[PDB]
Amino acid sequence: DIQLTQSPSSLSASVGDRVTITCRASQSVDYDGDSYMNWYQQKPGKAPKLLIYAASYLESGVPSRFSGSGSGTDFTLTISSLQPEDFATYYCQQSHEDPYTFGQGTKVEIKRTVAAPSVFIFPPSDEQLKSGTASVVCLLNNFYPREAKVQWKVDNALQSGNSQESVTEQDSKDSTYSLSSTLTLSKADYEKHKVYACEVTHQGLSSPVTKSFNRGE
Amino acid sequence: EVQLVESGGGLVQPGGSLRLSCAVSGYSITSGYSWNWIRQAPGKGLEWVASITYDGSTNYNPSVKGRITISRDDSKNTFYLQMNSLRAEDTAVYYCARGSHYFGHWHFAVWGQGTLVTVSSASTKGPSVFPLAPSSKSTSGGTAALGCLVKDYFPEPVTVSWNSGALTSGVHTFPAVLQSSGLYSLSSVVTVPSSSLGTQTYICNVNHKPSNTKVDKKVEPK
């Protein structure tokens, strides 16, 4: 099989900057004056979208800031000026021979100015408590960069190992991320304690932000 | 416009078989140069697995050749994927895709939406849906956050909309996490004007097709 290796595997670039992704094939994808390398853009939750075919042809409807070059074993996808909607994983694909193979993917995000999260906390619902479990949810909304630290405290005891978190894709509307963390406790443990706090550290905050509630009030 | 719509995803036991279909609309299936299946394991890249060209010739990736069949039903304008002896490596989103009559054929300009196949021995379980009520502790300025917690389901996926799809601004539906119980959990939140909480209804619409569980949950201040 023809193996395709992309470089880099991920990059972050200021909005409007030029971005270059390279693909190297383990053997030539040239045939009779054309080069059979293709490029796709895959946005989160979506099927890949074809950008470039036969190494340098722009697919209909694709913006002209995307272009492809190269021949033989070495190919480049260029975004001439990165736009906020261009957050995606980009894949090369050879169509010179079966099995048709894809590179491993290059993740591209827009590097915007630092933005601190808005932090919100949700106690467990009474409906859930009826069932014997309590989930406490902390939301960090609209922040940049993606790196953030959430610490749970219950009556000032640091919780470790009983929470999970999840981060959205970069939002093209403002190039931010959001994050949800869930602390899970038994109902009996939840009813044994009073103060529930989520403490957030992030580059946009000069000191950590704590959102908390008191069970009951 | 040509549209490709996959069906047949969901949970399959290891050693079982999958049967997927791709219904083509807005385009006659006999006019395509080739029809294809391409799959993507969670968080991994893309693997072409099978093609059928307009003359009916089929071809398979040797990574799965021997337990895969592609076929077409022109009268239903549909083509199919069958795979047997499934293993955990086969858990993936399966896409259908159309090849081209031009420029070497084997690049894919038209794709379906993908359907997730999960190969596991576990049982289907539909979710519980709990409110994330707006309160003083979920307010910043004149903005309030509220949401729904979609807890303890298997397999993926679940879809969440708000107000039947009419509410899209400020919505963030998070990727599900797999709990140590073997069940998924996810949350969907929306930020809205604090002044709307008394007057605007907010309903989250949850659908877990693997268990045929649909829930509409009204979320209001506590």
Residue numbers in the entry:
A (entry chain L): 1 to 217
B (entry chain H): 1 to 222
Can you quote the paper on this entry?
Immunoglobulin E (IgE) plays a central role in the allergic response, in which cross-linking of allergen by Fc∊RI-bound IgE triggers mast cell and basophil degranulation and the release of inflammatory mediators. Omalizumab is a clinically approved anti-IgE monoclonal antibody that binds to free IgE, also with high affinity, preventing its interaction with Fc∊RI. Instead, the Fab alone selectively crystallized in different crystal forms, but their structures revealed intermolecular Fab/Fab interactions that were clearly strong enough to disrupt the Fab/IgE-Fc complexes. Mutations were therefore designed to disrupt two recurring packing interactions observed in the omalizumab Fab crystal structures without interfering with the ability of the omalizumab Fab to recognize IgE-Fc; this led to the successful crystallization and subsequent structure determination of the Fab/IgE-Fc complex.
The structures reported here were the result of unsuccessful crystallization trials of the complex between FabXol and an unconstrained Fc∊3-4 molecule, but similar crystals were also grown from crystallization trials of FabXol in complex with IgE-Fc. In the first interface, with an area of ∼395 Å2, residues from all three heavy-chain CDRs contact VL and Cκ domain framework residues from a symmetry-related molecule; namely, the VL domain AB, C′′D and EF loops, and the Cκ domain DE loop. The second interface, with an area of ∼324 Å2, includes an extensive network of hydrogen bonds between an edge β-strand from the Cγ1 domain (β-strand G) and a short segment of β-strand structure in the Cκ domain CD loop from a symmetry-related molecule. We first attempted to disrupt the interface between the edge β-strand (β-strand G) from the Cγ1 domain (Lys214–Lys218) and the short β-strand segment in the Cκ domain CD loop (Leu158–Ser160), observed in the FabXol1 and FabXol2 structures.
